[PDB]
Amino acid sequence: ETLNGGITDMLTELANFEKNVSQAIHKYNAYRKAASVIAKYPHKIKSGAEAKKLPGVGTKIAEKIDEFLATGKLRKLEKIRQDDTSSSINFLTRVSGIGPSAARKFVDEGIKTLEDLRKNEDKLNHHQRIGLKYFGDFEKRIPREEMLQMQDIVLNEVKKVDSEYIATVCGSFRRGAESSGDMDVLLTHPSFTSESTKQPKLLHQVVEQLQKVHFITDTLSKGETKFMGVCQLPSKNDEKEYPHRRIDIRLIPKDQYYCGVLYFTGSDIFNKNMRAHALEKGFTINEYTIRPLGVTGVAGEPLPVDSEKDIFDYIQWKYREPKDRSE
DNA sequence: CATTAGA
DNA sequence: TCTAATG
Ligand SMILES: [Cr+3]
Ligand code: NA
Ligand code: NA
């Protein structure tokens, strides 16, 4: 956690670098299980060999470890960090829309900077177009103070279109969290469950509403179940406008909201921990349901959910307020 | 790990 | 169809 830290992080940087700048998934994979195992190691790694004894620790990695332990740096590391080319892919990548692949190509053609991106907007696709447009606002945190405002709006139109809509803004925001990155609104409706052959419009109607009133301003990607866009809080009485924000609304078969909700609420650990728990307690939990476990090793059969509760109950746990789902 | 764009 | 990018 801190005794193995430097090693891990160097490794992760290492790992990372392969995966993007280079097209080396394998090495990249190498760096991770290693960085994975060495992390759990109960003692201060003190030399490569020591490290080496470890499963996943090759001769190569070890060699790096020594040089890092011996000298507070790493060459390949300093050299990467420096390397303008790699620097660029690492950068371009920030654009929502851009990924490693396209990052390398942009470079290959010469677009290293944001500006280049500008002059060559032609070369970018609508997603990345919006990516480039709101570059700044995309990086910004979302003050819960605003979360309340957006959340507020979203609920109204939802209900305003059809009262049957249920809707939750999941994420850190649900978890209290002073700020959040993007807004996750979960959604469902009775008339839409497991079997009941969809009702696309379901999603569509709202998307239309929120836009209608100018909440949603940009569409990054709308599907029959997953809408992904840009929104922005009304700019009051001029002098202060709102930063354009990332937003995702997802349609759900009401017969699996809860789990889904539970799930997206997090945290990463609470889930996991909660998940591991249901196991002993003879169950299984995942993004959409909770099934009773069978001794034959495994088994099916989806239990019935009415609220975050039922689930809690099932595994016979103590209801954890979102606020406290932190771990 | 599943859902969308695009080509 | 597959291949990228988001989550
Ligand atoms: Cr989010
Ligand atoms: Na080994
Ligand atoms: Na990106």
Q: Which residues of A are catalytic?
A: 64
Q: What's domain A84-140's architecture?
A: Orthogonal Bundle (1.10)
Helix (H) or strand (E) holding A229: strand A226-231
Helix (H) or strand (E) holding A184: strand A183-189
Identify the burial level of A326 via C-beta atoms within 10 angstroms of its C-beta, where 0-12 means exposed, 13-18 middle and 19 or more buried: middle
Q: Give residue limits of the domains in chain A.
A: 1-83, 84-140, 141-263, 264-326
A288, A260, A305: which is closest to A167 by C-alpha? A260
CA of A247 to the centre of ligand 3 (A): 16
Residue A85 φ then ψ, to 5°: -60, -55
Q: Residue A90 to residues A73, A99, A105, A109, A110: CA-CA distances in angstroms?
A: 20, 9, 13, 16, 14
Regarding the domain delimited by A141-263, which CATH topology (the fold level of the hierarchy) does it fall under? Beta Polymerase; domain 2 (3.30.460)
* CATH number of this structure's domain A264-326, picked from the four choices 1.10.1040.10, 3.30.210.10, 3.10.180.10, 3.40.50.300: 3.30.210.10
* Sheet with A183-189: strands ordered across: A166-170, A183-189, A245-253, A226-231, A216-222
Ligand closest to Cα of A49 equals 2
Task: Look up the CATH number of domain A1-83.
Answer: 1.10.150.110
Two tokens, residue A13: 């940087």
Chain A span 186-245 residues with beta carbon within 7 Å of strand B = 221-226
Strand A283-286 and strand A289-292: pairing?
antiparallel
A97 touches strand C (CB under 7 A): yes
Do the two domains A1-83 and A84-140 of this chain adopt the same fold? yes
Experimental technique used? X-ray
Token pair 């209900």: residue = A159
Residues in CB range of A275: below 8 A, 6 or more apart: A285, A286
Ligand closest to Cα of A37 equals 2
Rounded to whole angstroms, the Cα distance separating A206 from A226 reads: 12
For residue A186, how many C-alpha atoms fall within 13 Å in the half-sphere facing its CB? Answer: 21
Angle between helices A84-92 and A75-82 (to 10 degrees): 60
A50-62 burial, b at 16+ Cβ within 10 Å, e below that, comes to bbbebebbeeebb
